[PDB]
Design a protein around this ligand. Structure first.
Ligand SMILES: Nc1ncnc2c1ncn2[C@@H]1O[C@H](COP(=O)(O)OP(=O)(O)O)[C@@H](O)[C@H]1O
Ligand SMILES: Nc1ncnc2c1ncn2[C@@H]1O[C@H](COP(=O)(O)OP(=O)(O)O)[C@@H](O)[C@H]1O
Ligand SMILES: [Mg+2]
Ligand SMILES: [Mg+2]
Ligand SMILES: [Mg+2]
Lengths: 528, 529, 40, 98
């Protein structure tokens, strides 16, 4: 029909569009199924420029494989939306979408209209949400439970030795920046990376690390007890907004005007020096200036002649962090400078690494902002560690924000499947078939786990389903013996919001895909 | 004929020009082959008898060198696994400064043995865990092999002997002379309670006579010329400025506006009188030489010549700071008569000529100073570049000795002992990870073998004799280079040593790189652009 | 070791050369020609 | 073979043959200035791309005007330049000696 109007159009009609969608979804899941679990394999990605990236994350893998497909774009966007809110669960999403489509096709290829399976999907989704609402476990969220959750979320990205190091740092930082209300605010945890000293030296610092140092050779490199002044006022040469020029008569007038054109900044420098002399009378303490704007060599010289360490052009967000860590006030003007505005720091020092300089502020009283210092010998190592740190922080934050945590390793999926199988007799019509399909898809999570550990899918799944049928304990897979295990007792924990969001997104996207009649490319080929 | 169309799924959604390798046969073994080729590229330049190599880059520049890091930098590698090996070697160079070839040799040996371990039936995880266990055991064993800790690092005759081994493998046949030169230069500037900084040693290359005419100077040399007509000083008070030696003006636009004739007549005389007053005020403090980092005006130069002031200018923003450190002067951003505390002092300042090159020398009669310089003379630029690289290796060795004082025997004694003890440990491990452990120990025999292969002898006899003599209890016996028949020698008596820290970091980084390469399972590559 | 054609001089394939008396003789010829133009 | 180690177009030679080739090239370089030595020495005429000519008996000048690109042969030009810089006389004896 559209071919008679646009001869260059491309079309895919009723029975072909469904085949295209199913084929592409299966193609995506066939690649992404090797990532699931702590036993997944690692991927290497090389771009056109020649840079190397080692990864195991689902989102990174999706966004760095060379693919041009429409429904692949849809699934990638869904995964991105899940990641940006929860930060964990971007592989199970793709796996469940693919399996749901495959199971639906199994029945559709026998002459059944997709709307029946859609209604079955909706009913099964409601029942599964009701069941998950009662499987969850509520606790106090002490340090040990958060340790377990963070470790569970971290062992799937790095090996055990590095995970045991990252868990403590992540949990300690999240607990340190927390108040008993006012939900957790990230951006108060700065991630800085240094390329040396193999990655078992990643650490947490109860202070700040700044990637720039002092620009005068005569400034002190170490300060033992310091006042911290945080400002964004400019000490650079500034000119009038309106056009202006000097008109002198001889050499002496030229000299007079030259010395006259600097008082507006000399006044600010004198204010700072007077305050420092007033507070730090004897030469025993220190004084450090952190500025968000530029500083001239003249102002640097004037400050260094007195024993002041000055840093120029700090990042904007630090304006808050220092105030929460050192405990002063960030000010825009000098017309009210007083000793209440100053913060305190117990150690300030500098470290030089090749061509770069770093400044450490440490030993604050009760810092509400901390720093995670990443270390390692390569660049892809640091990138991978950074992704793992993001995952762990999001997991701990989601655990605290909810009052509950869910057992993992696939126990909840088996429980939902068994509960859904006994619910399908109640519903009427052919929609039961759809319900069946849903149940089978929920079993894609345990199966793959077993298949990644070197066992056989069907017999291990039958063993798992043998329990939870005579003993109603929530049992999952043990990835080194293949026997069923009680997930809660061992210490495998999963987030609740992650599972709820995953169910919602998977059901919605699969339902919308199953009802597509025909694919059309009939518009302008390029926007030119 | 017919065609095999494609496989449905991922094979049909892949872009054009992209590649996808998966499995052991298409991913792991090919990576092992690439790493083996890279290791064989640089194996031949190992040891005192390793031969030089000549490389031309894409800009038609010429390198003649033995150092492995420079060779890898100048090549253009494409395979990702070799890129990981190169990055490991570069990290080792940055961290320590010597031992960038041990990394390549060890990593190649480890991957080569892992290939046959995988061929026989073992899985990658078991190979990995065996390698980690063996690495931990080796790091535990290593401190027991330490002998002859360094005693005094400000004695010239001991420092000269400690640095000889690190240069013997770069400039075989000229180790004593260069060792003594570097020892003098390093002992000059080591400060008390001092971190030794490496920047404070400068190298100047002048084309000319042979290498044996090289020297060390306590001060600075610049390849410049004097701006004024004074040429030498005998007792120099130095004033240093970062601003141009000229009348300074407003930042905002300024114009001289005159309304009568008398102002027009008087302006130039006023400027000249002001400039004369400024120069005389500067001169009255006793400064003989002025160093600036900007332009010098004609009238300022004329008045400097009038008052007998030596004027030198240099524009680097970094040479000025190093000179300020050398003479103890403080830079000034204004053109004002400086205070006594900002005076630099120098015993001699003069303009000299060495082999067609005119230089300005700031020279001290002091023995310590703040920085020192090494002046190299050669018949070819490439030779002087190689000598500079050897000097850098020696200075880094001195720095490491400052950090840690422990030495271990060299020439393959340490590797043989490590392999023997690791095999003995692995014979008592029940399980499948014993094989990997044993392979780790065998990977330590690639270091002596290479040496023998470069010396022109048979490696098997050397290794057999080393094992036989180590069975008796001689931990300090290694390969003898002078003999033309295979032989062994006591390394501790002959003074062949190497740092503990270098070996530690080399083993760590080599094992890390090998395991990281082994962990990759499938590769997705975009099309080159 | 098969001393196959190896490059020494840039654009070696296009540049020419003359050595010995022949070169000398060529010079003489040129000079004579010039003189025989001016003789008349 | 699927992915190669170095970039396409990299040319490598090793062993005795390359050393023998280098020794052979040095002979051509020395022959270039061989007959300019002594009280009975001739001199050479060199023409460049623009057309200007230069007539010389000095060895260093002749070696400079030759567009040598062989990496082993450039060393003989370098040593001639160094000898010219240091003492100023004897820039052909050193080449024949090497
Ligand atoms: N020690 C363990 N034993 C069994 N299952 C585990 C273990 N650790 C994690 N898992 C399972 O791995 C799954 C998550 O795998 P992961 O690779 O992190 O991908 P994603 O979290 O993005 O879906 C979870 O369902 C969890 O149940
Ligand atoms: N006199 C000597 N006899 C035998 N071996 C030596 C001698 N001097 C140095 N070596 C050996 O040379 C080896 C390293 O040489 P080098 O080419 O610098 O390799 P790398 O750059 O990896 O250190 C050391 O392992 C040391 O044992
Ligand atoms: Mg996860
Ligand atoms: Mg070395
Ligand atoms: Mg002569």
């Amino acid at each position: 029909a559209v071919k008679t109007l646009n001869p260059k159009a491309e079309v895919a009609r009723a029975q072909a569009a469904l085949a295209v969608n199913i084929s592409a979804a299966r193609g995506l899941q066939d690649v992404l199924r090797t990532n699931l679990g702590p036993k997944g394999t690692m991927k290497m990605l090389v771009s056109g420029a020649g840079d190397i990236k080692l990864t195991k994350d689902g989102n990174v893998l999706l966004h760095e494989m060379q693919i041009q497909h429409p429904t692949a774009s849809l699934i990638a966007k869904v995964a991105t939306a899940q990641d940006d809110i929860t930060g964990d669960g971007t592989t199970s999403n793709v796996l469940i979408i693919g399996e749901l489509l495959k199971q639906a096709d199994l029945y559709i290829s026998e002459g059944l209209h997709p709307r029946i399976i859609t209604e079955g999907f909706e009913a099964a989704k409601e029942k599964a949400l009701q069941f998950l609402e009662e499987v969850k476990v509520s606790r106090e969220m002490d340090r040990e439970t958060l340790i377990d959750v963070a470790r569970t979320s971290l062992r799937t990205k790095v090996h055990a030795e590095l995970a045991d190091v990252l868990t403590e740092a992540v949990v300690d930082s999240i607990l340190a920046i927390k108040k008993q209300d006012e939900p957790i605010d990230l951006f108060m945890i700065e991630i800085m990376e240094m390329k040396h000293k193999s990655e078992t030296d990643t650490s947490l610092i109860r202070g700040l690390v700044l990637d720039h140092g002092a620009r005068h050779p005569d400034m002190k490199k170490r300060v033992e007890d310091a006042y911290i002044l945080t400002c964004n006022v400019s000490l650079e040469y500034e000119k009038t907004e309106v056009n202006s020029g000097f008109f002198y008569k001889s050499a002496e007038e030229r000299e007079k005007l030259v010395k006259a054109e600097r008082k507006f900044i000399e006044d600010r420098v004198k204010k700072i020096i007077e305050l420092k002399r007033k507070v730090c009378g004897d030469s025993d303490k220190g004084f450090v200036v952190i500025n968000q704007k530029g500083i001239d060599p003249f102002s640097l010289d004037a400050l260094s002649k007195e024993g002041i360490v000055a840093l120029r052009r700090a990042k904007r967000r630090n304006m808050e962090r220092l105030t929460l860590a050192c405990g002063g006030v960030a000010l825009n003007s000098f017309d009210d400078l007083s000793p209440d505005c100053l913060g305190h720091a117990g150690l300030v020092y500098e470290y030089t690494l090749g061509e770069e300089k770093f400044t450490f502020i440490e030993k604050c009283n009760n810092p509400r902002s901390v720093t995670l210092l990443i270390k390692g010998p390569n660049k892809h190592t640091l990138t991978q560690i950074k992704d793992a740190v993001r995952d762990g922080l999001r997991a701990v934050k989601n655990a605290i924000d909810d009052g509950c945590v869910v057992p993992g390793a696939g126990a909840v999926e088996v429980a939902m499947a068994e509960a859904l199988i006994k619910h399908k007799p109640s519903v009427k019509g052919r929609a039961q078939l759809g319900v069946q399909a849903f149940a089978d898809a929920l079993l894609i999570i345990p199966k793959v786990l077993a298949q990644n550990s070197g066992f056989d899918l069907q017999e291990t799944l039958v063993k798992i389903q043998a329990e939870h049928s005579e003993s109603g304990q929530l049992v999952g897979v043990d990835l080194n013996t293949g026997e069923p295990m009680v997930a809660a007792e061992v210490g495998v924990w999963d987030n609740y919001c992650v599972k709820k969001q995953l169910l919602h997104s998977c059901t919605v996207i699969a339902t919308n895909i199953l009802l597509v009649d025909e694919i059309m490319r009939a518009g302008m080929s390029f926007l030119k | 004929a017919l065609h095999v169309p494609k496989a449905p799924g991922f094979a049909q959604m892949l872009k054009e020009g992209a590649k996808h390798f998966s499995g052991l046969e298409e991913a792991v073994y090919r990576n092992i082959q690439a790493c083996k080729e890279l290791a064989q590229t640089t194996r031949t330049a190992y040891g005192p008898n390793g031969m030089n190599k000549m490389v031309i880059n894409h800009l038609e520049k010429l390198f003649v060198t033995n150092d492995a890091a420079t060779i890898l930098r100048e090549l253009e590698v494409q395979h990702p696994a070799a890129k990981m090996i190169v990055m490991a070697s570069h990290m080792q160079e940055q961290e320590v400064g010597d031992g960038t070839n041990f990394v390549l040799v060890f990593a190649g040996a480890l991957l080569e043995l892992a290939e046959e371990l995988l061929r026989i039936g073992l899985s990658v995880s078991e190979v990995i865990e065996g390698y980690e266990i063996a690495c931990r055991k080796a790091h535990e064993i290593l401190p027991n092999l330490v002998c002859c800790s360094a005693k005094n690092l400000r004695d010239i005759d001991e420092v000269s002997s400690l640095l000889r081994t690190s240069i013997m493998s770069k400039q075989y046949g000229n180790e004593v002379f260069l060792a003594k030169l570097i020892a003098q230069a390093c002992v000059s500037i080591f400060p008390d309670s001092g971190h030794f900084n490496v920047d404070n040693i400068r190298v100047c290359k002048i084309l000319g006579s042979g290498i044996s005419s090289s020297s060390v100077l306590h001060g600075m040399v610049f390849k410049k010329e004097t701006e004024g007509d004074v040429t030498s000083v005998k007792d120099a008070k130095i004033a240093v400025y970062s601003c141009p030696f000229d009348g300074m003006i407003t930042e905002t636009k300024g114009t001289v506006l005159i309304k009568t004739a008398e102002e027009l007549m008087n302006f130039s005389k006023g400027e000249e009188n002001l400039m004369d007053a400024q120069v005389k005020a500067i001169a009255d403090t006793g400064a003989n030489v002025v160093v600036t980092g900007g332009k010098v005006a004609d009238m300022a130069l004329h008045y400097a010549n009038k008052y007998n002031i030596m004027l030198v200018r240099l524009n680097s923003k970094w040479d000025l700071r190093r000179l300020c450190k050398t003479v103890g002067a403080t830079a000034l951003p204004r053109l004002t008569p400086p205070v006594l505390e900002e005076m630099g002092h120098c015993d001699s300042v003069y303009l000299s000529e060495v082999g067609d090159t005119q230089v300005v020398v700031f020279k001290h009669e002091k023995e310590d100073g703040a920085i020192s310089t090494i002046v190299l003379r050669g018949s070819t630029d490439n030779l002087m570049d190689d000598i500079e690289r050897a000097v850098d290796d020696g200075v880094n060795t001195f720095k490491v000795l400052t950090r840690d004082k422990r030495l271990v025997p060299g020439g393959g004694a340490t590797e043989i002992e490590l392999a023997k003890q690791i095999t003995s440990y692995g014979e008592t491990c029940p399980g499948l990870e014993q094989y990997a452990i044993k392979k780790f120990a065998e990977a330590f025999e690639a270091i002596p073998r290479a040496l023998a292969e470069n010396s022109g002898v048979k490696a098997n006899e050397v290794i057999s004799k080393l094992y036989a003599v180590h069975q008796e209890g001689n931990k300090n016996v290694g390969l003898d280079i002078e003999a033309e028949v295979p032989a062994v020698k006591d390394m501790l008596e002959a003074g062949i040593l190497d740092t503990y820290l270098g070996k530690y970091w080399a083993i760590k980084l080599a094992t890390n790189a090998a395991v990281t390469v082994l962990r990759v399972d499938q590769i997705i590559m975009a099309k080159p652009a | 070791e098969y001393g196959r054609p190896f490059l020494i001089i840039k654009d070696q394939d296009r540049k020419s050369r003359l050595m010995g008396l022949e070169a000398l003789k060529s010079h003489i010829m040129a000079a004579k020609a010039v003189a025989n133009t001016m003789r008349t | 073979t699927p992915v190669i180690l170095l970039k396409e177009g990299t040319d490598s030679s090793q062993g005795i043959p390359q050393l023998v080739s280098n020794i052979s090239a040095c002979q051509v370089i020395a022959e270039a200035v061989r007959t300019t030595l002594g009280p009975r020495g001739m001199d050479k005429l060199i023409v460049d791309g623009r057309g200007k000519a230069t007539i010389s008996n000095d060895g260093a000048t002749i070696l400079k005007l030759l567009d040598v690109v062989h990496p082993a042969a450039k060393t003989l030009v370098d040593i001639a330049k160094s000898q010219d810089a240091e003492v100023g006389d004897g820039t052909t004896s050193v080449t024949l000696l090497a």
